[PDB]
Amino acid sequence: NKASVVANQLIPINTALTLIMMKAEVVTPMGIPAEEIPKLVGMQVNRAVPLGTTLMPDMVKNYE
């Protein structure tokens, strides 16, 4: 089990992701793989993402 993107602070609804917002941790269930962090920068979340929440594909606008 590989590391996922996890929120490093509360990320408000509709906020564009920045690097300070995204830590990487081995969690279950699996979220977006950690290697995607630099590619996620600039993309908005479609809901608030509390600190410690695993970031999932469905939470990111325009993510495939």
Resolution, Å (one decimal): 0.6
Map residue 46 onto helix, strand or coil. Answer: coil
Tell me how far apart the alpha carbons of residues 37 and 45 are, in angstroms, rounded to a whole number: 13
Structure method? X-ray
Using alpha carbons, select from 40, 42, 48, 44 the residue that is nearest to residue 13. 48
Helix (H/G/I), strand (E/B), else coil: 54? strand
The CB-based long-range contact list for 34-38 (8 Å cut-off, 24+ gap) reads: 34/2, 34/3, 34/4, 34/5, 36/5, 37/5
Q: Where are the domains of the chain?
A: 1-64
CA pair distance 17, 49, nearest whole angstrom: 11
Q: Which of 33, 36, 14 is nearest to 25 (CA)?
A: 33
* C-beta atoms surrounding 47 within 10 Å: 13
d(CA 17, CA 11): 8
Domain 1-64 sits in CATH 3.40.630.30:
no
How far is Cα 24 from Cα 28, in angstroms, rounded to an integer? 12
Scan for tokens 């917002």, then name that residue.
21
